[PDB]
Design a binder for this molecule. Structure first.
Ligand SMILES: N#Cc1ccc2c(Oc3ccccc3OCCn3ccc(=O)[nH]c3=O)cccc2c1
Lengths: 408, 544
């Protein structure tokens, strides 16, 4: 097979990223995985004249004994994929969100047949670390299309379209979208029919040489978390103060909010526990604001040229709230996840993957998360619960959202 | 016979071209003698004037060796994959029946250099008389001071070792610089047999090792440690001198001792080294720091040894709160035989919690364990499970600690106060506020209360935020055991909500001391300048 020429953006040098320390179990898995890959020609060992490096981790990926290699190509993608996003980009279907059921399949094993440009392989360098620096780390580079590299789906896109053409013709009502390493298959059929169609698609790829490992998303059920003011029979001064604060906050997102009549209730230096009757004018003011908050927010459009930003807040009892935005108060989506009951880190890791999945389905793009957790904590244990084949960008907010949550 | 590693210069740059400084003729003859021998062994080869590149040579009994300044060539040479800076920690080693040091002689000179890169390594022997053109040479093997010689040697050694390693999976071979450390649990006879096989195997590739001249097992004085066959320790540490640099080297020695000597403290002395930048400058010896040196001398008098690692047993880490902002920890498998020790100091910042600091220390120790042993330890921590559960459930951030068990070793980590989640009925409601003029650096603070109480205090050399905190303090002082406080300051709310145990701000510490004495405190926030009754009244009082 011929290799598409690949070039890093001009004025860019290949990634030089430190390999995070690993546990002995993960190192042993990675050496086993990479030993077999080297035999099959997918990777080969490299010399010290290759200064580049990209991190490598091992995830269980819900497999009971199977260990999966994950390469953190986030730096290489930033230095490569943006050029590849324009030249060899992939479109996004606006209907995948509308579909009743979407199933996500791993097509990463497909990329290993296509070869990579010899002048680019050095940038794919990774290091299997060692315990207590007892030995030098084992160093490999990719001879084929890497699984985590955003250039890999772009190059394979031609071959993917040919493989899926027969199935798509027989099933024109099914939507298929390819984010890096994954195939999002959406249908409006019954779950049993959808599941049988999915297996038929898996067999189709297997007949054409694409092995699929052996979840089910329902985007139609998705709904935003609307702002909800409390409804009380008697209001304390504290209740009205909190209502004023929450209404004052919502003024930034919703034009039209009024706190005049409600604030007039709070005239004077009263005690917090004192019950206050509500003036009819304020009762009208509170009711009007509820209607304004009841209406869905309008006027925010997704700008493909901008980054998406995801903020997460830790509510109690296993609940988390999140907002996705490109502008500070123009939210493209807000939601709330409840845990089945679990470590906070495991909950946060699950939240991050759920939001990214939704962001991929809705916009074909991953947001940059602002994680409410210490960096070292997240770096140590994020791999433990991570099941996705991609890794989103993240940063850490160590400043508490002292501002009341007002996200429920 | 070793395969070469292709080497290239940086893209923009080109080969070095420097002029050789004159030197004494006795040195010139010595350089001539050294270069003639190297030429015989194939290490260097004479060149003509077709080569345009030169790098300066130099000469330095007990001696007269050859030194080449490759700094310019190094500046023009490509970056390589850097050799591993971290050195194996002795506590990570596993006890072995025998262990041998095979240092490699003339290691760099055994490994070939890329033919296309040899030109740049060219050097010119100084002419005895300025009239004659000097002799010229170029390296065919790795130059001593070159940028890529360490990395290329390591990769070549790894390739040479890989077959022998597979043939003998029982043997453990560790590579550090030119030394190869080999350990095994064969009987003493088979250990020497395989050591000799390894020596022969390296010889086929032109690498020489000691034979029956191997370093003695007890005095393994390696990288500042003593590697005994049964244990390890730090090499003896000395230490009165009050120069700034003398303090810095003392602090370094104390830190290095803290690997295995429990209780070494450096907090007071580290405060002495505060950006003075004058190594010669003498420093006043605070009695707090001067006593700290005395305490360490008591500890250093006790000979301390650490144990090696046993994979079958569990890693235990136990942490003690030492002083304020200082934490000490021990890592062990057997009840009193420690693998190693260490310290963790409060990371830079104000308004910290002992619980929060404890979690960070657990974080630091956890990462250290993975580097050394490849797994994470079980923790013994001086905090009640009830205290930790309250903190994590109400903490705004996602936190986690691995499995741990309470140890009733005081001081215990505790939450010194907890604020109320709901307004207190029958408690006076204090509406506090503050404000200051930025140009004057002056302001005022006070409160207005439901029962009619009021107060304003004049303030000097304050900022708006400091007044806002000061107003909260005023209400706390002039209140009963149960108080409800209403503020508009997000800054104030944030500090108090984070429940800081202490800080560098004497005002915040005073607020903490008032908060602890209080039976119940509820703090509420209201938007500023929005016509809230209590807030509006106090805003006029404080600012006018
Ligand atoms: N000089 C020196 C030197 C020598 C051996 C080193 C080393 O030696 C080892 C090499 C391979 C495996 C275990 C090793 O040491 C385990 C701990 N140990 C160490 C020494 C000893 O007598 N007995 C013992 O149980 C491991 C790491 C560094 C070493 C440095």
């Amino acid at each position: 097979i011929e290799t598409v020429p690949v070039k890093l953006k001009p004025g860019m040098d290949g990634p030089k990223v430190k390999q995070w320390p690993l546990t002995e179990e993960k190192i042993k898995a990675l050496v086993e995985i990479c030993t077999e890959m080297e035999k099959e020609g997918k990777i080969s060992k490299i010399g010290p004249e290759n200064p580049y490096n990209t991190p490598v981790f091992a995830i269980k990926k819900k497999d009971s004994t199977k260990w999966r290699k994950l390469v953190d190509f986030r730096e290489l993608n930033k230095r490569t994929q943006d050029f590849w996003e324009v030249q060899l980009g992939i479109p996004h279907p606006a209907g995948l969100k509308k579909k009743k059921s979407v199933t996500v399949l791993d097509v990463g094993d497909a990329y290993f047949s296509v070869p990579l440009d010899e002048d680019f392989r050095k940038y794919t360098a990774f290091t299997i670390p060692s315990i207590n620096n007892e030995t030098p780390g084992i160093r490999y580079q990719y001879n084929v299309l890497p699984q985590g590299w955003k250039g890999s789906p772009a190059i394979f896109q031609s071959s993917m379209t040919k493989i899926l053409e027969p199935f798509k013709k027989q099933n024109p009502d099914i939507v298929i979208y390819q984010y890096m390493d994954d195939l999002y298959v959406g249908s409006d059929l019954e779950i049993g029919q959808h599941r049988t169609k999915i297996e038929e698609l898996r067999q189709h790829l297997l007949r054409w040489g694409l092995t699929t490992p052996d979840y089910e998303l329902h985007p139609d059920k998705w709904t935003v978390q609307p702002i909800v003011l409390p409804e009380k029979d008697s209001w304390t001064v504290n209740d009205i103060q909190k209502l004023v604060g929450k209404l004052n906050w919502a003024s930034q997102i919703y034009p039209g909010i009024k706190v005049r009549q409600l604030s007039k209730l709070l005239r004077g230096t009263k005690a917090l526990t004192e019950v206050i009757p509500l003036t009819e004018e304020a009762e009208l003011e509170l009711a009007e604001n509820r209607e304004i908050l009841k209406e869905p927010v309008h006027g925010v459009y997704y700008d493909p040229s901008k980054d998406l930003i995801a903020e997460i807040q830790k509510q109690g009892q296993g609940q988390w709230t999140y907002q996705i935005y490109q502008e500070p108060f123009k939210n493209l989506k807000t939601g709330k996840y409840a845990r089945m009951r679990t470590n906070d880190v495991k909950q946060l890791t699950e939240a991050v993957q759920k939001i990214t999945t939704e962001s991929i389905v809705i916009w074909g793009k991953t947001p940059k998360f602002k994680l409410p957790i210490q960096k070292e904590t997240w770096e140590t244990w994020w791999t433990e619960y991570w099941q996705a084949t991609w890794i989103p960008e993240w940063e850490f907010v160590n400043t508490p959202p002292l501002v009341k949550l007002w996200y429920q | 016979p070793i395969e070469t590693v292709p080497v290239k210069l940086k893209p923009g740059m080109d080969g070095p071209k420097v002029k050789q400084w004159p030197l004494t003729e006795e040195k010139i003859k010595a350089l001539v003698e050294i270069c003639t021998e190297m030429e015989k062994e194939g290490k260097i080869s004479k060149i003509g004037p077709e080569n345009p590149y030169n790098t300066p040579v130099f000469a330095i009994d007990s001696k007269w060796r050859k030194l080449v300044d490759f700094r310019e060539l190094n500046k023009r040479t490509q970056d390589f994959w850097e050799v591993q800076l971290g050195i194996p920690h002795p506590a990570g080693l596993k006890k072995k029946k025998s262990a041998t040091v095979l240092d490699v002689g003339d290691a760099y000179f055994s490994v070939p250099l890329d033919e296309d890169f040899r030109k740049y390594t060219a050097f010119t022997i100084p002419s005895i008389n300025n009239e004659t053109p000097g002799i010229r040479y170029q390296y065919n093997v790795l130059p001593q001071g070159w940028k890529g010689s360490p990395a290329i040697f390591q990769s070549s050694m790894t390739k040479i070792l890989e077959p022998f390693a597979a043939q003998n999976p029982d043997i453990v071979i560790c590579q550090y610089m030119d030394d190869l450390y080999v350990g095994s649990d064969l009987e003493i006879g088979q250990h020497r047999t395989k050591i000799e096989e390894l020596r022969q195997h390296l010889l086929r590739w032109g690498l020489t090792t000691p034979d029956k001249k191997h370093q003695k097992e007890p005095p393994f004085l390696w990288m500042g440690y003593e590697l005994h066959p049964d244990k390890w320790t730090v090499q003896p540490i000395v230490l009165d001198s009050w120069t700034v640099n003398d303090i810095q080297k003392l602090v370094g020695k104390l830190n290095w001792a803290s690997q295995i000597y429990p209780g070494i403290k450096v907090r007071q002395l580290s405060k002495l080294l505060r950006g003075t930048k004058a190594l010669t400058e003498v420093i006043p010896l605070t009695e707090e720091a001067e006593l700290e040196l005395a305490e360490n001398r008591e500890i250093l008098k006790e000979p301390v040894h650490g144990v090696y690692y046993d994979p079958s047993k569990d890693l235990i880490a136990e942490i003690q709160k030492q002083g304020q902002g200082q934490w000490t920890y021990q890592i062990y498998q057997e009840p009193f035989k420690n693998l190693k020790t260490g310290k963790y100091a409060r990371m830079r910042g104000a308004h910290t919690n002992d619980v929060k600091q404890l979690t960070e220390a657990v974080q630091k120790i956890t990462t250290e364990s993975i580097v050394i042993w490849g797994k994470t330890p079980k923790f013994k921590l001086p905090i009640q499970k009830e205290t930790w559960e309250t903190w994590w459930t109400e903490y705004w951030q996602a936190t986690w600690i691995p499995e741990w068990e309470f140890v009733n070793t005081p001081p215990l980590v505790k939450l010194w106060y907890q604020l109320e989640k709901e307004p207190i009925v029958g408690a006076e409601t204090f509406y506090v506020d503050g404000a200051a003029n930025r140009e004057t650096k002056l302001g005022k603070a006070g409160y207005v209360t439901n029962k009619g109480r009021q107060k304003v205090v004049p303030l000097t050399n304050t900022t708006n935020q400091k007044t806002e905190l000061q107003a909260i303090y005023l209400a706390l002082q002039d209140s009963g055991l149960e108080v409800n406080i209403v503020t508009d300051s997000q800054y104030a709310l944030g500090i108090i909500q984070a429940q800081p145990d202490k800080s560098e701000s004497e005002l915040v510490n005073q607020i903490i001391e008032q908060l602890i004495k209080k039976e119940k405190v509820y703090l509420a926030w209201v938007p500023a300048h929005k016509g809230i009754g209590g807030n509006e009244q106090v805003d006029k009082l404080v600012s006018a």
